[PDB]
Amino acid sequence: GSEGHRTLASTPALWASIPCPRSELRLDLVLPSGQSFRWREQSPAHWSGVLADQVWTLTQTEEQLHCTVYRSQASRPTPDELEAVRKYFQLDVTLAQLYHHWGSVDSHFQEVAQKFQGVRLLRQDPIECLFSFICSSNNNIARITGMVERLCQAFGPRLIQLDDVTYHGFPSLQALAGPEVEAHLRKLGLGYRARYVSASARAILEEQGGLAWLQQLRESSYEEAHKALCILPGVGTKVADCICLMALDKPQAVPVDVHMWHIAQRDYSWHPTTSQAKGPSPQTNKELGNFFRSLWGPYAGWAQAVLFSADLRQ
DNA sequence: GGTAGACCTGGACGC
DNA sequence: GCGTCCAGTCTACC
Ligand SMILES: [Ca+2]
Numbered sequence: 001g002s003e004g005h006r007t008l009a010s011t012p013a014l015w016a017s018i019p020c021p022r023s024e025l026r027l028d029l030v031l032p033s034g035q036s037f038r039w040r041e042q043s044p045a046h047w048s049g050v051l052a053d054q055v056w057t058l059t060q061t062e063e064q065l066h067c068t069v070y071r072s073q074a075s076r077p078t079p080d081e082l083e084a085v086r087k088y089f090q091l092d093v094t095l096a097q098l099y100h101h102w103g104s105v106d107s108h109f110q111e112v113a114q115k116f117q118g119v120r121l122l123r124q125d126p127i128e129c130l131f132s133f134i135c136s137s138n139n140n141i142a143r144i145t146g147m148v149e150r151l152c153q154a155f156g157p158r159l160i161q162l163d164d165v166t167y168h169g170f171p172s173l174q175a176l177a178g179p180e181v182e183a184h185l186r187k188l189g190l191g192y193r194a195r196y197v198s199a200s201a202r203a204i205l206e207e208q209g210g211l212a213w214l215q216q217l218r219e220s221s222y223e224e225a226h227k228a229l230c231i232l233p234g235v236g237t238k239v240a241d242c243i244c245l246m247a248l249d250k251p252q253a254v255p256v257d258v259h260m261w262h263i264a265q266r267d268y269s270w271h272p273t274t275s276q277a278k279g280p281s282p283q284t285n286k287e288l289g290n291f292f293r294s295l296w297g298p299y300a301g302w303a304q305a306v307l308f309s310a311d312l313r314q
Numbered sequence: 315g316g317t318a319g320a321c322c323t324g325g326a327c328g329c
Numbered sequence: 330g331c332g333t334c335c336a337g338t339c340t341a342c343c
Contacts (some may be wrong), residue, residue, distance in 0.1 A: 033330075140336035146322060191322025196338085236338050276316070283316070 004163045005042045006057050006068045016076045018085060019299045020065040024095045026118030027060055029309045035122050035246055037132055037145045038152070038170075048162070053085035055167045066088075070160050078178050084153040090123050093302075102296055102303050108267055109296075109303065119303050121246060126214040128170040129247040134234045135198050136242070145188075150188040151197075155181070173211055176201035196234025199212055203232055222250040236287065245301040254292050256285040263307055 007127055031039040031047045039049040049059040052100075055070040056077075067085055077085075086092070095118060103110040107239075112125045116285035135147045156168035163220075176197055185194035187232045204213060208231070217225040225248050227238040238255050246254035261280060270291060272284040296303040 022324075137337040138321070138335095142325070143336080147323090185324085189323065192338095193322075217326080234338065238337055259336090280316075 002074070005046065005048055005165075006070075007043055007046060008059050008066050011068070014074060014076050015066045015068050016045045016082055018067060018082055018091070019063070019064040020060070020089075021063050022060060022090060023058070023117045024093075025065065025120060026090060026116075027065075028177075029116060030089075030122065031058075033145045033304070034308070036124060036128075036142075037148045042162075048165075050159060050167055051088055052081070053159075053169055054081075054238075056085070056244070058085075070156070070162065073235045074194070081120060088123055093120065095120055097300060098299055099103055099306075102306070105297070106295060107280040109307065112267075112310045113306055116306060116313070119306045119309045121251070121305055123249070124247040125170065126217070126243065127173065127211070129243050130200065130214070130232070130235070130239075131171075131176065131197055132228075133239045133242045134200060134232075135190060135193050137193065137234060137236070137239060139193075147160060147188065147190050147193075151185065151190070154184065156190060173201050173205050177205050193234060201236065207312055215249050220248075222248075222253055225250060226253065241289070241301075251299040251301050252297075254304055255291040255301070256288045259308070260288060260304070263311060264291065267307075277278050 003257050007013055027042075028045070031041075031049075033039075035213070039047045042048045046057050046059045048055065050056075057068045057070075060204075067077050067082060069081060099113060099117065103113060131146050131151070132144075136144050136153070140187070141200070148289070152168040152170055153166075154172035155178075157172075159167040159169055161167070165233055180200040181201075182194045185197055190197065204210060208228075209216075213228075215231055217228060222244055225244050226240045227235070229235055230237065235243075238257055241253040241255040244250035245255060258280065268277045270288070272278065272287045275281070275284045277284055292304065293300045
């Protein structure tokens with residue numbers, strides 16, 4: 001009863017509400033591995049994970065976002081705690097407003113977007129996002145989720161246990177920088193990315209000024225930020241964009257990959273013009289990214305998320 | 315400066 | 330059921 005993951009039905013007195021229409025947010029479209037890889041629908045329509053260093057379970061109704069915290073006497077979330085939720089979902093950004101603009105300038109978005117309202121971007125932690133996406137390169141979402149999970153089990157701070165699940169917070173730079181971590185990661189299956197995680201941790205900590213460095217990029221320019229990020233091992237343009245776009249408040253960053261070429265090509269008949277080659281290449285990927293930035297504007301990245309959600313569901 | 319190949323893993327095809 | 334193919338960075342190199 002008071003054990004296991006909670007539910008809106010089962011322990012009512014424990015949930016608080018955040019005004020939020022399913023049109024402005026769709027948990028089933030945002031939390032599935034892709035932006036973050038740490039949320040799990042442990043119970044239908046109920047997603048659990050670590051948010052702001054505590055475990056929560058989120059579920060929604062047609063006009064309400066219900067939340068629940070596990071921290072020591074159990075109680076519905078406090079108001080401030082709920083804010084952390086709004087900050088994470090960047091609720092002050094109005095999806096209706098953004099969708100309208102994109103629709104206005106792009107008939108195809110206009111079409112496709114209808115069935116997939118409520119796709120926004122999570123404001124993630126630089127560290128987690130950096131390393132989560134270092135694991136994403138030349139890989140698929142299934143393995144990535146697995147890799148990230150093992151990584152957090154083995155190196156992240158132990159949080160609280162629900163049923164047979166012991167939550168962990170994302171590892172720290174120090175942790176990831178520790179000795180013999182690479183051999184450890186290799187044993188978890190991150191393959192060659194094992195070294196990348198190990199090296200980027202040490203690199204940040206011993207060559208760029210530590211944690212503060214990343215935290216400074218939130219204030220720098222996308223151009224600068226993306227630039228700086230590329231230094232780290234296993235971090236190219238793509239991963240650099242993911243980080244800028246999902247944790248460094250750079251909403252115009254557009255992560256270009258084979259996925260995107262497919263969309264650019266079959267939905268816009270897009271061709272590289274000022275570039276050289278006909279297929280994917282550093283110059284051509286740079287172009288594809290510019291194409292969408294001028295087509296969608298300042299929040300191009302957010303827009304891309306919408307097409308990706310609608311696409312995969314087909 | 316702008317290409318090619320190589321690359322840990324493991325679920326998908328295709329033969 | 331085996332071998333090839335998918336799902337970004339990095340480096341050797343013309
Ligand atoms: Ca590929």
